Amino acid sequence: MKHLISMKDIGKEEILEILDEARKMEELLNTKRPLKLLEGKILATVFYEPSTRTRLSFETAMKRLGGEVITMTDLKSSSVAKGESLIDTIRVISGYADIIVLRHPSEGAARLASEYSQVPIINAGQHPTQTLLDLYTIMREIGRIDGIKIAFVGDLKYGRTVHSLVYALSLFENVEMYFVSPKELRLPKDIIEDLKAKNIKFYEKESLDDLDDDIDVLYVTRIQKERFPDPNEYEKVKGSYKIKREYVEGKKFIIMHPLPRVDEIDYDVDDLPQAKYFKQSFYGIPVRMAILKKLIEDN
Amino acid sequence: MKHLISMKDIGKEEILEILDEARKMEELLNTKRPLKLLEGKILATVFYEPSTRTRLSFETAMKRLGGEVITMTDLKSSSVAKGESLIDTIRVISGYADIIVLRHPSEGAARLASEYSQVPIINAGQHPTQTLLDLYTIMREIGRIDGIKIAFVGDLKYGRTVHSLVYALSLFENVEMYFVSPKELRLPKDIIEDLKAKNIKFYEKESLDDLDDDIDVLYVTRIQKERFPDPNEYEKVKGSYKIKREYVEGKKFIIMHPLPRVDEIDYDVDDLPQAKYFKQSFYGIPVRMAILKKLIEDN
Amino acid sequence: MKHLISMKDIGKEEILEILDEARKMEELLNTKRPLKLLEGKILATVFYEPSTRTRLSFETAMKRLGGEVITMTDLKSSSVAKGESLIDTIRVISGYADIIVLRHPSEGAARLASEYSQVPIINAGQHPTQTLLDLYTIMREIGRIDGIKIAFVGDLKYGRTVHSLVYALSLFENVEMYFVSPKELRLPKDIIEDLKAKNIKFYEKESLDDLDDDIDVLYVTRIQKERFPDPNEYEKVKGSYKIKREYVEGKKFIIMHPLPRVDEIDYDVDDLPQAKYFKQSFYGIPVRMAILKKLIEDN
Amino acid sequence: MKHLISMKDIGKEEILEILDEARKMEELLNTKRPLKLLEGKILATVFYEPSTRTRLSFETAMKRLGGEVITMTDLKSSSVAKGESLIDTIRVISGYADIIVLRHPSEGAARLASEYSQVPIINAGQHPTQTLLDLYTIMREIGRIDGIKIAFVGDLKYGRTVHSLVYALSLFENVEMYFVSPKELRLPKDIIEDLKAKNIKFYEKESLDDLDDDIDVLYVTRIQKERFPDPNEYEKVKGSYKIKREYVEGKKFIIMHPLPRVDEIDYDVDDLPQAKYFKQSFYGIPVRMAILKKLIEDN
Amino acid sequence: MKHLISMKDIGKEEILEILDEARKMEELLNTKRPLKLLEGKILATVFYEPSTRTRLSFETAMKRLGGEVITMTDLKSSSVAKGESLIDTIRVISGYADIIVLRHPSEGAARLASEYSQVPIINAGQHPTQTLLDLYTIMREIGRIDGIKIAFVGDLKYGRTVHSLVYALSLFENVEMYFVSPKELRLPKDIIEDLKAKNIKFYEKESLDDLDDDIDVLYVTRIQKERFPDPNEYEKVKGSYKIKREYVEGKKFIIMHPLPRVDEIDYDVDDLPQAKYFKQSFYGIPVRMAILKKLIEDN
Amino acid sequence: MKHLISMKDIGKEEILEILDEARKMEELLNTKRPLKLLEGKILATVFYEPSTRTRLSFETAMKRLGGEVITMTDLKSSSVAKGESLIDTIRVISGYADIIVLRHPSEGAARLASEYSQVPIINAGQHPTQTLLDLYTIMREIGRIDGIKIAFVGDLKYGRTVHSLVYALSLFENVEMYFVSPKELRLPKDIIEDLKAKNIKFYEKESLDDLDDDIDVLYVTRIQKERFPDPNEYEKVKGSYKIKREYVEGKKFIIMHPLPRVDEIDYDVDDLPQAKYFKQSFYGIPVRMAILKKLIEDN
């Protein structure tokens, strides 16, 4: 493996290898002793669109392995405004660092970049590293990925991360999926087709109540106010799909949600044992530590 | 007419009415005398995405009619970052001004806005005012819109303005359209269908050479370097479709191009008589003067 | 009157005079005819802290009277970063404009400014113009200021505008005030003192239900999420004091709220007849028109 | 003329004509009545480098004559970052406005602009308008320009405006010039040569004391802290050339200084009758009113 | 000790413990050899209000101990503008780093943060680390903290750091305090009360002359021009309290001043042996090294 | 060697010593093993004018040697806007770091800085480090610096780096220089004089054709669009001096060009063996590693 550009470039095997490696990394973290696996390496963060959340994750992961980091975050008067192209920049940074995490708006910028890069590229957005992080959390908390009952709540139409996860989970055995959302935000039709094709049992419900306390994972998508020009549409969705304390109490599921959370989950839900979004956030360090080490040694 | 949101809400009649009124406005400008048609009116520029080019046009047009203007340009910590919704803002500005030019990213923001606005809304981006401006230039310079041979060169795929013009022109009699562009940037298929449906003769050529003297209008689209992550791709397109002096000399056509022009047209083309992009720019004032007056009196 | 710096510089008489003049201004606006009361005058907007909301109001008001406006909005590299002091700036603008609306952070900046200004200063924040605007709305919609039953809901502790209004209303006869809020956000003690001293009957309730349908005006303060570091605190307040449709239906009161409104009032409340916040927003133009004219002629 | 690009394009004649017209404008301002000399005209402010001080002056002047203004201030992502050249912009604005005030960094941008502009260009920086403003102040306050004893204090080496004034004053009869400054900041040698050539009597003194009460005008240059990397150097200069009250009292001269003033003049000097810097600031409106009218009618 | 939020949470004991540890750290720095005390640790700088001065100090201290650092500095579109609360951020960073330096505007943000943080929080503003730094300088240079004669010059009213130091010093034996300042900037009354209560001998003088050569430490506060809207007020204070060379020569005291220094101390004072502000700046690294190590091991 | 401020402070000796040490560093990089030469050192990046390009180079170099870095990049509200002078900042950072890379606009800021710095200063702009980087590339690729035939193409007039290299190369034996450029951009006269004085054979050609294949190095300068207000001038230069593939094929020279490259070199040239600009970019790390180590040990 030499690049991590898309989840569709990784099979059920790589996924399990990475997850296994991630488990080791996690154990190493508890050691609470100075790790030096990547002692002499340099990770370069090339973001054409700022993202502190992302930068921090990778920077922390790399530093935990004993490596160093150099950042560069600007599509502004740093190169694109001037005239320096993505290719030239990638060739220059490619010569400075040992691995690169790229964040670019253009569709095939990451694929294109990996062509001119003489170093491994990690696409930070299709966000592979987020999907792996999701699978690691499920396995870590539920004990297994195969044969689980997971529900997706929220914007399944425009949900970036959601589609990537629905696809990755479709590679495992007996996974029941429940798609809860408004009618206007139902899962894309071509994805529903691929699920039927792969012969996966799923349901499309409209209310959070239609679910039953038999679900293992409740995955809440991000509901971004900006995607809804009409405020009534937003107050309609948020009000009908917000996860409240009353609804969570005594249930068997764990709550998952890729940060940030604005109105998708009440704050009084944070203390319940089934609230795992913050634990999930943490798991991001171990799996990114795994992905960094994996890509460096493989080269 | 109470709103100007989309070209598809205007028929061949309003189009001719507007163009006719634009003609009068232009004459009035030559008068070089203080106009006061909208003496006591206030135009509000509500841009959620900055655009000096647009703001200036409308602001100049309104002031030429003797009116006043109040500007507001921020999706940032002016309302969206805070929490004020498009609707509340539209209701407040609706109470301050007599007419509003709106520029928002969201798809149906303009339509939605016009529902809560107690004042005419002009959608500045579908860019109606730009298409009208285009039609007024053709008529003004060629003498007629019906039965003309127009060629569109450049990015016909992501071209915003181009699609709007191809549609508007399809409402006139015997207009021959020549679509010159790379294979990767050919006109969207569903637009080609509607042209066949409307029974309009068009051609899809690949080189600027398959054109000679029959053509009345050469419309050059904007080729934005930012749309092409791979510099070789942009270098290719620009090199094969740039309008040079040699190619323009002695031809019958007039050159049109919505500013700004970066590499689409050589500067030595600017003195040729067929170069009309700067005159086109000017025409924007008269037609916007017409649209403003039209929408205000109609209410 | 030569300056409008503080509400405590205005007595029950000026207040009624201004409100009276504001009424005329409103009538004049309906005329829908070009006003020219301040035809040759220039208003300068000197904001050391940006505020589109404020700038727009005064700029619209001034332009409705037929005057012109010059803006200047920066405490940044416009003077303070360089070294130009508030006094020098005020003396320069004082020479350019006929009246000035100032917005500065420093406590006595406005008072100090008026000392060096050879032109009327209007303090835009103590926000006088907002309080007058509030009183004009009440009188305009309820018919009288004296003898009304008004309730204040929300943050009465940090509430800015609220204190200014409670004081202004204390100058009128038989005004019953109901202070509804959480215990942590009760009205400042020294203000409660002054109310008892002035012999004014008021109540400090904790729930929106303790309120009967005998209230004439329901004034909802702004609940800013930024004032609450602990999200649970903000969630509690908003959830217990948000104005919902169910609670407003069939009641005699009119709802008042200085924009912007984020979570203080549900959108489905906007169609009820008792929702007046957008009307209130409009009233701001007439009263500012009055304040501008008043201060200019008085000098 | 048709353009105001450089002082060296104006002879002692135009200078006196402008100054005479500026006097009329000033009288007209006192009228305190709505002027409409340029009632139907539009002034465009094209600044590639922000300058509120400049923008405000011209905008106020234009509005006092009854004209309108459209602003555009960005060398950033408004055109230069994108790709739109100064020429294209000048050709577009040239079609919108009736006159243009340009502010560009490049050496010959203004001259070049005037070639492509179909409308008068006023160069706001060589700053012509500031020098005229200076001469108008001297004549207005001293009664005559010919035969005066003027002293220049401060940074005569990097002082911008100063050189422009020394040159303009060298066109008049019997002007004695006293150049007071540190040795490191003496007037450029080639300027001293041109003064000897024109046979003008001048002196280069080092202390403010060497000057006698026989001086009609004391011109204090701007001492900007940023031009001095070594704080001691800056400290030296300011301490030895700051204008204090004690030094000004009872003297015959008037104090002149192009704002802003940071440390060049103590605040306690502002009350003395010989302090004219704020009066000078005001005079800027009349002379700019003259320059705008002059350039518009002349075309 | 698990958090350093306020000086009032630390007794004369911890203060001496920290100071002692700081001494060791200093010695270790002179070793000029790679320290690895915190070799595998990560410090997170969470600033909601930018402050390079602060960030640099802690970042340098942490790196001197052999640790790593991850920065995050934005209250802007990084979380607060979006919607992510201080708590969620603290819970996420709490999972990435081993210790956190927090800088927030809200009053109890630090206290609140420490409740949800699973890692030690260091409040960088009440600024503890600056006060300790101050006490370490005094002890380091004077030899003892107990029984010293210290004078505070400048803004004792708005002086942030000053109050924190007057309180800390009140925990030691026989400390004579001299409060030199204008009448308008006298030490807050409630602080003077607590001093009388603790039975501490102090004096409130108005001139720098009232001080005798018996004083051991002359502590000059920061005089920020922005706190004084009236320039005369600022000119007044600076002129009467600036520390000049003449006044310092031959005196027994050492001069202290928390950088930056603008006009509080002349540059020609920097060479005198009693000028210690730059030495003090240095001491900040050792004591912060101590505070970081102390808080990490204690957990 | 204690400071690297100007190339004119370095003789043919140090140049060769640095280049030799740079060679070692490069070899050490290939080792691909953790270097720890500067294990316990801290490099401080003090940029008063942002420059990611520069910051990245030095930060990477320092980290490759096993050192740490602290950054500070602001002339804005970090010190200059406030009041902190370059000297105070240099004295403070001087106490934090072990070496400093300074980037300041003022002419003698670096020289002045080194006076107050108790640590080595590296001037990053006169850009020494870029010239050395240039010489290292030539020696590394051509085998020798003495007796080479180098041609300079482009803007020799405003070309900054170019002058620095022409001078440095004039210290070696038998270097033939060919200066290819438009007439308006010829090499500064005083530089041509010094070349004649040093008795160096050079030629001033106008076309890229006038050059022969005997040339060992083709150095292409940066052609910045911003330096040319007239767009026609820019295209005349770019069109006549851009390096195309056709012109490079089969020739013996290597192409050099300090990044970024916008229009100076076609992308299809990047694959040719003689294209060394990206290789040159890389060489920047080794030589900066040398310069850092050299300056630290020498002190």
Swiss-Prot record, chains A, B, C, D, E, F:
Catalyzes the condensation of carbamoyl phosphate and aspartate to form carbamoyl aspartate and inorganic phosphate, the committed step in the de novo pyrimidine nucleotide biosynthesis pathway. Pathway: Pyrimidine metabolism; UMP biosynthesis via de novo pathway; (S)-dihydroorotate from bicarbonate: step 2/3. Belongs to the aspartate/ornithine carbamoyltransferase superfamily. ATCase family. L-aspartate binds at residues 82, 160, 222. It catalyses: carbamoyl phosphate + L-aspartate = N-carbamoyl-L-aspartate + phosphate + H(+). SUPFAM superfamilies: Aspartate/ornithine carbamoyltransferase. This is Aspartate carbamoyltransferase catalytic subunit. Heterododecamer (2C3:3R2) of six catalytic PyrB chains organized as two trimers (C3), and six regulatory PyrI chains organized as three dimers (R2). It is an enzyme of class 2 (transferase). HAMAP family: Asp_carb_tr. The keyword Transferase applies. Carbamoyl phosphate binds at residues 53-54, 103, 127, 130, 259-260. It comes from the Archaea. One of its GO terms (biological process) is 'de novo' UMP biosynthetic process. InterPro entries: Asp/Orn_carbamoyltranf_P-bd, Asp/Orn_carbamoylTrfase, Asp/Orn_carbamoylTrfase_sf, Asp_carbamoyltransf, Asp_carbamoyltransf_Asp/Orn-bd. Its EC number is 2.1.3.2. The keyword Transferase applies. Pfam families: OTCace, OTCace_N. It comes from Methanocaldococcus jannaschii (strain ATCC 43067 / DSM 2661 / JAL-1 / JCM 10045 / NBRC 100440). Keywords: Pyrimidine biosynthesis, Transferase. The gene is pyrB. GO terms for molecular function: amino acid binding; aspartate carbamoyltransferase activity. GO terms for cellular component: cytoplasm.
